[PDB]
Amino acid sequence: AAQTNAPWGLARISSTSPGTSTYYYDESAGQGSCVYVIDTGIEASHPEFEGRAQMVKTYYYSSRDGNGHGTHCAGTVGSRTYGVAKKTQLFGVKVLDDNGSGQYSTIIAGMDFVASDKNNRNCPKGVVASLSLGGGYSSSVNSAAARLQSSGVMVAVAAGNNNADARNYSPASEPSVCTVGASDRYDRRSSFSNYGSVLDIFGPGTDILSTWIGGSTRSISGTSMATPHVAGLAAYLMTLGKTTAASACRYIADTANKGDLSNIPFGTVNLLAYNNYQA
Ligand SMILES: O=C(O)[C@H](O)c1cccc(Cl)c1
Incomplete structure (x- = not known):
């Protein structure tokens, strides 16, 4: 399949x-996989999700995304126009409030929750977790x-946006998960992107068009935007049967640009995420 006039980031991950x-991708499009988006929530009713998005847990008064950030990230994972894996199932876990903040205890609870909840879900092709957050x-x-990674979920996390070594940030600095830095459309490291030896892969992170609340769209920047590109690529x-949850980060690095x-x-x-598609 080919999506013409795609957002630059989708084009970038299917080109050398x-x-x-043009975004070139296999028609299976992540069908039968599941991606948990652990963030401010998801506007599940957004038409771009085509009913494939659902909120499963909130740690606040509402399960609604009152911010937009989680909706934007979910959109890069799997919306029809803006998503890497256009047929994957999306589950929302709201660990961040509508101001974008949240305590470590709630973020940990949300991670423990996914490790258990996935056993209740029909995800025959595997489970991914996308964490565009940290501190x-x-x-x-x-x-x-x-x-969460040990339980059989591929965990992708943002490196952080301080133009600093990611070893001083969490969960970015955990060696066993897949830590994602940001690049721009000119193949530079984004000026804000953290770096360091704990990084595993780069994805498009500057000026990323995706879904937003109110049934809208908008373009925003961050390692928070690169992470769902890698999460969707894993799904x-x-x-496609090319890798499993335990080894997807390694496989993505092995086959990267x-x-x-x-x-x-x-x-x-x-290393820049690359789907290696061949028509
Ligand atoms: O740069 C920041 O905003 C925070 O330090 C941080 C750290 C890790 C991941 C994110 Cl998305 C943000």
Whole structure:
């Protein structure tokens, strides 16, 4: 399948070179996989989700996304126009309030919840968790992310947006999950993107068009936007049978575009997510 005039990030992950505008992808499109979007919630009623999105847990008064951030991330995972894996099932876990804030205890609870809840869901091709959030180093937060990964869920987390070494941020610094940095349309590291040896992969993170609350769309930047590209790619590759939850991060790094990025400091991988599609 080919999506013409696609958002640049989708085009980038199906091309060996920047500047293209077509997203090439296999028609299976992540069907039969499931991605938990752990964030401010999802506007499940957005037409772009076509009924494939559902809220399953909230830690606040409402399960509604009153912010937009979680809806935007879910859209890059799996909306029809803006999504990597256009047929995957989306589950929303609201651990962040509508201001975008949330305590570590609630984020840990949300991670423990997914590890259990997935056993209740029909996801024959595998389960992914997308965490476009973080804060300062916490061993408890890292441990919760490691537990979620250990339970059989591919965990993708944002590296952070401080132009600093991600080793001082959580869950970014957990070695066993898949830590995602941000790139822009010119194949530079985004100026805000954290870096360091704990990074596993880069994805498109600057000026990312996706869904927003009120049935709208908008373009925003962050390693929060790169992470759902990698989460959706994992779901897509798991449906194709190319990898499992335990090894999808490694497989994505093995098959990435290598050496293409600029502004990569010594010690950081130069790898850009790539779906390797061949018509
Ligand atoms: O840069 C920040 O906003 C925070 O430090 C941070 C850390 C880790 C992940 C995210 Cl999305 C944000």
